[PDB]
Design a protein around this motif. Structure first.
Motif, PDB file in Angstrom:
ATOM      1  N   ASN A 168      -1.374   1.566 -10.725  1.00 31.05           N
ATOM      2  CA  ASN A 168      -0.993   2.497  -9.540  1.00 31.05           C
ATOM      3  C   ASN A 168      -1.887   3.682  -9.715  1.00 31.05           C
ATOM      4  O   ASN A 168      -2.939   3.407 -10.695  1.00 31.05           O
ATOM      5  CB  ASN A 168       0.309   2.703  -9.133  1.00 31.05           C
ATOM      6  CG  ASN A 168       1.338   1.887  -8.454  1.00 31.05           C
ATOM      7  OD1 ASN A 168       1.392   1.877  -7.314  1.00 31.05           O
ATOM      8  ND2 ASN A 168       1.757   0.901  -9.161  1.00 31.05           N
ATOM      9  N   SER A 169      -1.888   4.564  -8.889  1.00 29.80           N
ATOM     10  CA  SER A 169      -2.735   5.664  -8.979  1.00 29.80           C
ATOM     11  C   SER A 169      -1.905   6.980  -9.557  1.00 29.80           C
ATOM     12  O   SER A 169      -1.995   7.976  -8.551  1.00 29.80           O
ATOM     13  CB  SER A 169      -3.659   5.828  -8.070  1.00 29.80           C
ATOM     14  OG  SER A 169      -4.398   7.141  -7.970  1.00 29.80           O
ATOM     15  N   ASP A 203       0.770  -1.127   0.002  1.00 30.66           N
ATOM     16  CA  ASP A 203      -0.042   0.028   0.030  1.00 30.66           C
ATOM     17  C   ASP A 203       0.836   1.358  -0.062  1.00 30.66           C
ATOM     18  O   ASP A 203       0.646   2.307   0.824  1.00 30.66           O
ATOM     19  CB  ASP A 203      -1.212  -0.097   1.306  1.00 30.66           C
ATOM     20  CG  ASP A 203      -2.160  -0.973   1.026  1.00 30.66           C
ATOM     21  OD1 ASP A 203      -2.475  -0.891  -0.272  1.00 30.66           O
ATOM     22  OD2 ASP A 203      -2.580  -1.475   2.003  1.00 30.66           O
ATOM     23  N   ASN A 229      -0.406   1.821  -4.524  1.00 30.24           N
ATOM     24  CA  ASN A 229      -1.037   3.181  -4.857  1.00 30.24           C
ATOM     25  C   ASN A 229      -0.357   4.345  -4.994  1.00 30.24           C
ATOM     26  O   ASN A 229      -0.433   5.197  -4.038  1.00 30.24           O
ATOM     27  CB  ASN A 229      -2.067   3.178  -3.704  1.00 30.24           C
ATOM     28  CG  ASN A 229      -1.889   3.541  -2.357  1.00 30.24           C
ATOM     29  OD1 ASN A 229      -1.547   4.726  -1.826  1.00 30.24           O
ATOM     30  ND2 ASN A 229      -1.454   2.363  -1.796  1.00 30.24           N
TER      31      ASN A 229
END
Lengths: 170, 25
Positions: free
Chosen positions: A106-107, A63, A85
């Motif tokens: 991912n972001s 995370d 993320n």
RNA sequence: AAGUGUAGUAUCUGUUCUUUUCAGUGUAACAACUGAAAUGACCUAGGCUCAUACACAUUUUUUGGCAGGACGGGAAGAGGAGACGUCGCGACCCUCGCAGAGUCGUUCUUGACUUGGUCGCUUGAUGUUUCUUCUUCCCGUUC
């Protein structure tokens, strides 16, 4: 939970397939120098106990929010960041000779967030962003090429002088 | 650490004959 | 007015008590007595458990060895470039599929026997080997 040296000492440590070397990180959680997989790594830290012997870092399935907090690692060539993320990239990354970066799934939202990848001098040959929202934005490919021309293969596609020139035109 | 200076029927079960090893085949 | 000795008995109370074995005496069997001493490792009370001459005389190690300022990219403009190889970005191409490979004896898995290639780079990466920098702009480190 946290990536701490006690964890650094005792993960499944071995040699990549590719014969890339490393020594992994798992007292109870998140790993380094091999298989940093599936132990809920929030923030990278305490890379020093890695003490340099690692070619690769398989961060996938954690995370992780951003990619900073990298001690100077001369040996690290490959980062497998998948299934995290990552919103942002540090910028003073500059781990010399980081040839490969895997940002898949991912972001990262904005083009501008990709800017820090230009810092990777001439080593970041392979970069894969596929699976991010930024890929959908217009002229994504060309902007990555004009921003980091060091990349030889993007999203497992190879750059090519044609779209290099189009990236110059815009 | 802390060495500072200043300034049950045992004979009964043998007597009765119990707790002695034996076996029925 | 009180009172002794010989043999023997019963009954209190006080006191003693295992670190573990082995062997002998002893005992109806015990008990008791007499001698010695394992230390280490492992598994869930237990153990067919385990242990206590040479390497200096041709193929190797005694040798043929020695001789605001700086930096670092990338681009432009002015006065690094030829071979010869060896491994890569793309492809109008080639090619089209599950198996170190191929067969057999015996048994639920082993022992024997045989034997990317091509074109570009539209400024990819690299070691022989001969010859002859300045200025401007941008992005990083340092003070």
């Amino acid at each position: 939970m946290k990536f701490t040296p006690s964890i650094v000492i005792d993960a499944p440590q071995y040699y990549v397939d590719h014969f890339n070397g490393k020594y992994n990180v798992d007292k109870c959680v998140i790993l380094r120098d091999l298989q940093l997989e599936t132990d809920s790594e929030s923030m990278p830290s305490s890379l020093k106990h890695l003490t340099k012997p690692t070619h690769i870092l398989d961060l996938t399935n954690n995370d992780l929010i951003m990619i900073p907090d990298l001690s100077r690692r001369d040996d690290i060539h490959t980062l497998l960041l998948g299934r995290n993320n990552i919103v942002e990239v540090d910028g003073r990354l500059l781990p010399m000779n980081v040839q490969n970066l895997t940002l898949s799934n991912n972001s990262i939202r904005r083009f501008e967030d990709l800017q820090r990848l230009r810092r990777a001098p001439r080593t970041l040959k392979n970069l894969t962003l596929i699976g991010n929202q930024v890929c959908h934005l217009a002229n994504y490919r060309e902007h990555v090429l004009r921003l980091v021309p060091h990349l030889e293969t993007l999203d497992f596609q190879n750059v090519t002088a044609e779209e290099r020139k189009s990236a110059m035109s815009f | 650490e802390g060495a500072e200076q200043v300034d049950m029927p045992y004979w009964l079960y043998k007597l009765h004959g119990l707790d002695r090893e034996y076996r029925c085949e």
